[model samples]
Target: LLAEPQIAMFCGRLNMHMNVQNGKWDSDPSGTKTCIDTKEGILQYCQEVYPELQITNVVEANQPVTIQNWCKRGRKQCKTHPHFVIPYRCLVGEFV
Candidate 1:
């Protein structure tokens, strides 16, 4: 059976993926752009839903840390390309 934490994390990541693909925040009135930037909120929600999951550090220490780059207002710099992918891995692992 899938653990509760695992399910929560899965749903959280899935939601973010869908939003990004649909260009949900590509043009925001709040000045926020890029799925990378908006993902922080989702991360926070996961953390709150499952404190033991430690969802904040999904990125491995060796992985490169990429921050969000917002396009200027009224600019067409944002592209809805599938190439923009944010990789994440949960910190917990089996001791096998």
Candidate 2:
């Protein structure tokens, strides 16, 4: 069994909090990792974390960053965050 993969999101690993309840921010740094883990995964966990980041992902540091790839809020009610240094490693998100 491949088992459940737990890939860390650049937003989560940076301590980006989501689903705040009573001012208690619920943050999920490590979550289910899948090659297809994109958009929904990040939104479900990293929702409202950092929209300014523009749902950026990198296949490699030397590659050019693409924009608006099914990860940002598609006609949602939010845009907005604590900045963090997204490592080049985590920047290379998996999507299969």
Candidate 3:
């Protein structure tokens, strides 16, 4: 139960699995890439391999209400809190 399977599980009505990005991408730069790649790869594979599978109800986490709310709050807090600043530049390290 990893990546696509995990996301498939997430997409199900049960919502048994926590989102894979929750811990890794919460406030980390590399985690962002991991999340983006994982998401893209999952959907791409699903599209290519299982075209018949209707993903109409899959969650879009980047919207104003869903996942972006946390990002927006982080942006505000990062600006206000002197000690906390999110890295503006995406660091492409060996982690990829």
Best by TM-score: 1
Candidate 2's displacement at residue 25, Å, is 2.7
lDDT of each: 0.34, 0.30, 0.26
Q: Write the per-residue lDDT of candidate 2 for residues 1-96, one digit (tens) a residue.
A: 211111223332222232223322223334222122454554433323443433344232343222121122232322233322321222323356
The true-versus-predicted C-alpha distance at residue 51 of model 2, in Å, is: 22
Question: Model 3 residue 80 lDDT?
Answer: 22
Residue runs of model 1 more than 4 Å from their true location after superposition? 4-37, 57-96
- Residue pairs with colliding backbones in model 3 are none
lDDT of 2: 0.30
TM-score of each: 0.26, 0.21, 0.20
List where candidate 2 sits over 4 angstroms from the true fold: 1-15, 29-37, 43-96
1 or 2, greater by TM-score: 1
Q: After superposition, how far is residue 45 of candidate 1 from its true place, in Å?
A: 0.5
Cα misplacement distance, residue 85 of candidate 2 (Å): 10
> Model 1 over residues 2-94: C-alpha lDDT tens digits?
322211112112212212223232223333322334445545544543455445444422333222333443433543333333434334444
TM-score of model number 2 = 0.21
Model 2: colliding residue pairs: 5-33, 35-96
